[PDB]
Backbone:
């Protein structure tokens, strides 16, 4: 907002970033914390070393990261990491080639000084907006500063998006062709089988209906099963096995596993000699699991299955085709990876999928609109001042009236941060509730929902008023589009410095916390001191997890939209976008080459989604600048309207020319170089659900 | 407009319809005109008779037409006729079930008499609108007359559209499964092959690239060729053969074929003994055609081909799949019928197709907007009064000042009717210019363009002003959507009687002229007296042609939109819509069972398009009534806004649940009952282009 607050926030973020980098560089060199700072290269083969020798050259990572091509990344991590890095590089190139023509636009915005004029009539001032945005009359010479800049932005964005989207398609094709025998090229996913086997069993029905269609190309079809009870039993058995393995970790005296600690127990006398207490439970669980498996593999298998062909071409062409003359049944989709499909979420009819999709999307919109109200209600509770229930009361008033005056303000921060923390998981679960028979697809849907929510949160909370219900009711009863666009244009230059300082804060704090891995550091050390006792537990204690593409991508794209929407309004933030995406490229390269381990392949499927939302952000920027040059009287329409049409046409052309190659594997790459005859039962045991594994 | 003009026009249309039906019923009974009134049943097998005996029962056709189920129509004509009749029956059912609840709505519109009040303040009056539309205050009890009627319309439309769309899918599946060995189930259409065979020939490249993909399933691929010159030579040779056959028709004396009559000739002395003059030309044409064929089948075949598999399943699944990892090349589409694909229009790259599509659509929009200006310029020419060039001048003034005072007004009618006559062919050609590798697809595109043009012609020429350029400029500089919808609502009740009388005119005149076939009657009789001399020429002189689904469907759907948009505004026209579609059902049943012969199968592909535009018309009706109840103050939003959302959702659901079954044949119906082993060269000779037929 104000210059002083902006400087204070920027300096604070810079200081925290500096101290975090110093901590990271002083602590990474210790060999005791290698498993948490290089969890990759220690689970993947064995490369725990600094890279060359015992002596670690200072700065320790920029040389290693800056000399790693996309081939190295694809060799180490999945192709999805490569397409994410293409995203970072592409937006960096857009921002840098835009900064190449940033140089003039600043000059008229400083030479002309209409902010100084009587337009202030004795809020929108920080001595910084004096340099960026509003130092132009209603009708002065803004040709170079407005049209000659939006044309440059659009041209560089189109060029970079086209070239990058082509490059991602090339990477996908190159990786897909040069593959091995993976148990995904051989299968499809039928999930709308007609309910009645009309007097027979469902599996025999599936097998007969597909053997009549594809003779000589069939192993046999695995049918989805109601895995609820058997899944629960197998989870309990695995927990019992892990607890028993933990029990013998002491190996010194007899064990005593606490029972009252579990909460819903009181058998303290049975804690001693837990070996028998766990072996009997294991035997009972094994018997129950065997009976449950025998029941579930024969009692009412549900109406969905996977199918296996004996030739990659047959599966690659039988997944894109149409089976039944009516399309509401026998729906066929390409079978995902064994670790990327959702058995529980699967087996949902088409109408149920549509109904769930609409209800979940409507609920997401309802939450987006009514977000603030429950937060305000939770903040308004007596919890603000709970002095009546303070047990210690040693010196609360002294410590809260001196420096803790923000605790009363801290509680609404708590009521908000709890929701922000739970939100990614909630959105992922809601996306998984729409039927989404692919967990990568669920990740994409959750990312889209989170990005939309973040935009409609930040933009509404900055430009317009904070009464969202009143705002939407008014705009419902307000005159139509033209003055709405005028308001959109006029409200943005209210305070760009807030966006500057928010970009700086996210930049410095987020990247410091990420590269430092300080939270995983503390958690790992505490757990090493905590309950974790056996080497098996600690070996699985520091597992890195995926790149978390369900929340990194929406945050990065939110910053992308922030950058474009003010790209030439207040062209100062172009530097901030450049530095954000540059440090992101560097830090994420070091991370995805040293710490993160993927959970998918997805062969770059995220990139059409990323491209679509980047183009949407560019289109929104074009509309915003159209409105702004509507405000400042100008040759408004004849500058941006053809270019908005061009954006729409370019989107359609990009889809029509490359989107087809991302949805399906191609037959030209589905018969390339089969050398070793593919196995038969290995693919099954890849798609056999983990609970129903030990069987015959 | 006025009551008198409305009555005069309706009576005139009724009288012309009556006299035309009397002429048709008096003349159809003559056996001399059987080939023109029953061209079907005389080309298809042999059924020229009245049906039972020599004595023709009066009314002669209603009993025969009313006792013909869809099975009979499919046996005689193609399934496309059946889906067209389902269209007529469905809209008839919608209109009739709406007339079932028409009964109350008229009563308040007559009991309440606000038109009589001072709102007229000493144009929108014909004593008929006193009964229909505007006899309601701004805020009286319009609940039953407005909301309780639009809900009924929407419910009956949804029910009928759903049931009918299901029934069309059922007919398509039943006809497709119970088929024979047709040379279309065996082929696909590759039309984006990469240009270079990099030092080889294109045909060998296609064959190698597809033999590497589909071993053991391949006849060989026919590659498209530059058929311009060879097509021209073959057309000239066919014309020469027909002329020679006509020459020997006299068979009495020596022939004398005129040469100066051709226009670009003066060899009158060579007219005698045209037998040699034509045999020498035939021999030269045969030699030139053989040389041209030998050249074209080997010299630079273009970059597109058709492919033939040896199993219907392989073709049905290899047409919906993706071949090359990049989708811009090796595009695969289901091969159309031998008579329904366009060799000349084929072989166009994807970018060229997109560019041509956008330019043609933009040109269509430009013509739609600037339509009237060239018509006005042509009307303004001196041609209105050409007295200076009147050669006879026997008594022009006497005959033009008595009853021909409308000749000066007739000339603009000429300048308009010429464009209306040429327009369907122009639109079909423009649609064929977008690449459209299927002539049925071109028919659909031309129908869509014609329907849009007709709507934007009639609605603009009735409600708003006639200065389209000024209107669009104003609305560009006019305030936004809300008042535009208010104007849409307020301008419709200006004169509904014009729409009543236009529906009556189209009804009576069009159906009388159609069933009478008076124009084909006169043309056939004149040609029988005219140049046509041999029996072969006359046998091909009365060929009926197709059902002309490129102009019947848009006209019928234009009347459908007219009916809905005023369905409860002025509920009188519901009777007119009912009678129009009922007489259409009757007349078109008699025609398509007795006169018309199809040129396609298309297996009901038109019906998704018809359904989409019917739903669009219903949505436009909902928007219109939303605006109208905005005008008359009412519970406007909470009545129609959820229902507009419902219309959008219903469209999406219908697409997702049935549209898949219309685009492709299914594998379940692609291996049903192969009894006789399919031929090999027969399918080729079905797809061999007519010019390149005689070869080796």
Residues:
């Amino acid at each position: 907002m104000e210059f002083g607050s902006f400087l204070v926030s920027l300096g604070t973020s810079f200081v925290i970033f500096v101290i975090l980098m110093l901590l990271f560089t002083w602590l990474s060199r210790k060999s005791g914390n290698a498993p948490i700072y290089y969890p990759n290269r220690i689970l993947k083969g064995l490369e725990p070393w600094e890279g060359t020798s015992l002596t670690r050259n200072p700065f320790a990572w920029m040389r290693e990261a800056l000399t790693s091509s996309e081939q190295d990344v694809v060799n180490l991590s999945g192709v999805d990491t490569a397409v994410h890095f293409v995203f970072l590089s592409t937006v960096l190139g857009i921002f840098a080639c835009s900064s190449l023509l940033l140089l003039p636009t600043l000059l008229p915005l400083a030479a002309t000084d209409n902010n100084i004029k009587n337009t202030k009539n004795a809020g929108t001032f920080s001595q910084l907006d004096n340099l960026s945005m509003a130092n132009i009359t209603k009708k002065s010479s803004r040709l170079w500063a407005f049209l000659g800049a939006v044309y440059w932005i659009s041209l560089v964005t189109y060029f970079f998006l086209w070239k990058a989207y082509k490059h991602v398609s090339s990477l996908r094709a190159q990786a897909l062709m040069s593959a091995d025998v993976k148990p995904e090229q051989f299968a499809i996913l039928v999930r709308d089988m007609p309910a009645p086997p009309d007097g027979q069993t469902q599996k025999e029905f599936i097998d007969s209906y597909f053997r009549e269609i594809y003779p000589e190309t069939f192993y046999r079809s695995l049918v989805a099963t109601e895995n609820s009870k058997v899944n629960k039993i197998w989870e309990k058995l695995e927990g019992y096995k892990k607890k028993l393995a933990r029990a013998e970790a002491i190996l010194a005296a007899t064990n005593n596993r606490p029972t009252n600690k579990t909460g819903f127990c009181g058998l303290v006398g049975k804690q001693v000699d837990s070996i028998e207490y766990y072996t009997e439970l294991i035997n009972e669980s094994v018997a129950k699991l065997e009976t449950e498996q025998k029941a579930v593999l024969a009692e009412k298998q549900q109406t969905a299955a996977v199918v296996f062909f004996t030739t990659r071409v047959a599966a690659a062409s039988a997944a894109q085709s149409l089976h039944c003359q009516m399309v509401d049944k026998w729906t066929v989709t390409e079978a995902p990876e064994p670790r990327q499909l959702l058995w529980q979420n699967l087996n949902i009819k088409l109408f149920s999928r549509i109904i769930r999709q609409y209800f979940i999307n409507f609920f997401v919109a309802v939450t987006i609109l009514f977000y603030m109200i429950p937060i305000a209600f939770v903040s308004a509770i007596t919890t603000l001042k709970n002095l009546q229930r303070i047990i210690p009361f040693i010196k609360p008033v002294v410590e809260i009236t001196a420096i803790r005056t923000v605790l009363e303000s801290f509680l609404p921060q708590i009521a908000l941060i709890v929701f922000l923390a739970m939100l990614p998981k909630l959105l992922l679960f809601l996306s998984k509730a729409e039927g989404i028979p692919s967990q990568s697809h669920a990740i994409r849907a959750a990312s889209s929902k989170y990005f939309i929510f973040s935009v409609f949160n930040v933009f509404i909370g900055v430009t317009l008023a904070g009464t969202l219900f009143n705002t939407v009711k008014d705009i419902a009863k307000n005159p139509k589009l033209d003055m709405i666009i005028n308001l959109l244009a006029t409200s943005l230059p209210k305070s760009a410095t807030f966006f500057l300082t928010y970009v700086a804060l996210k930049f410095f704090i987020g990247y410091g916390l990420e590269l430092s891995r300080i939270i995983p550091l503390i958690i790992f050390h505490l757990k090493k001191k905590y309950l974790c006792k056996t080497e098996a537990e600690v070996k699985e204690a520091w597992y890195p997890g995926d790149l978390s593409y369900a929340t990194r991508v929406p945050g990065d794209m939110l910053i992308l939209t922030i950058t474009f929407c003010y790209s030439v309004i207040a062209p100062l933030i172009l530097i901030f976008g450049i530095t954000y995406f540059g440090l992101g490229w560097l830090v994420l390269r070091n991370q995805a080459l040293k710490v993160y381990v993927p959970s998918y392949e997805s062969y770059g499927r995220m990139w059409p989604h990323i491209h679509q939302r980047i183009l949407a952000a560019l289109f929104l920027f074009q509309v915003v600048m159209f409105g702004y040059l509507g405000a400042k009287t100008f040759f408004y329409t004849a500058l941006v309207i053809p270019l908005i049409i061009t954006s729409l046409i370019f989107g359609y052309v990009c889809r029509q020319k490359f989107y087809g190659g991302f949805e399906h594997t191609a037959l030209e790459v589905a018969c390339r170089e089969l050398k070793q005859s593919p196995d038969l039962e290995e693919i099954f045991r890849a798609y056999i659900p983990h609970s129903l594994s030990s069987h015959k």
